[PDB]
Amino acid sequence: GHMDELFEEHLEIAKALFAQRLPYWCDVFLRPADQAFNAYLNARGQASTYLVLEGFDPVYVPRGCDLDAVRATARARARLREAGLGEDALPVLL
Amino acid sequence: GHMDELFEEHLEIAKALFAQRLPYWCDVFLRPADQAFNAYLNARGQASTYLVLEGFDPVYVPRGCDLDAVRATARARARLREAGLGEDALPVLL
Ligand SMILES: [Ca+2]
């Protein structure tokens, strides 16, 4: 598939979450596209900070969402992932 | 290989900074080795969060260091870099 379309559709997902000032937990991209997606969000008008938490949990965080709260959320996500919960059942923001 | 030495030597510096809850702005890694260094820190027992805003300025943030403060610092660093200051003269933590 084209990367432009992948980035465009994931931008639409990000926008839906960012409209509520929620972070977008998304690990679908390979390297270095994972980091580049943050440049895409910012270029397209969606102010975003990229974090990788707990070693391997990436997230795109809108302005207006507390980064320390996202890190706290990642700690809980890690415990729940280890217990076998799928990504869509993990907490988005504590 | 030289990458193994690179990661091992920078681990030592990160450990020293993290002991004082200071972030490590380290620009010696070529993307995507920048993100991989954060994975290495975590794999070696140094709890670290990787943060990227809008320029090349890799940062590795320990537990107990405020990520919102690091984000604000990244913004100030970018503005000062744009004005001509060298990396060594930039703030590490507002
Ligand atoms: Ca904070």
By DSSP bridging, strand B24-25 and strand B48-52 are unpaired
Burial (0-12, 13-18, 19+ Cβ within 10 Å), B1: exposed
Contact residues, chain B, for A66 at CB < 8 Å: 68
**Minimum Cα–Cα distance from A49: chain B residue:** B53
Q: Give the integer Cα–Cα distance in Å for B17 and B26.
A: 11
**Resolution, Å (one decimal):** 1.4
Domain ranges, ordered by start, for chain A: 3-65
d(CA B90, CA B48): 21
A57 is in an annotated binding site: no
Question: In chain A, where does DSSP find H-type helix?
Answer: 3-18, 33-43, 67-82
- Cβ distance A51 to A70 under 8 Å? yes
Which of B32, B42, B51 lies at the smallest CB-CB distance from A49?
Answer: B51
Residues of B with Cβ-Cβ distance to A32 under 8 angstroms: 31-32, 35
Sign of CA dihedral B35, B17, B92, B29: negative
Which DSSP symbol is given to B2? H
DSSP result, B41-66: HHHTT--EEEEE-SSS--EEEETTS-
* Contact list, B39 vs chain A (CB under 8 Å): 52, 55-56
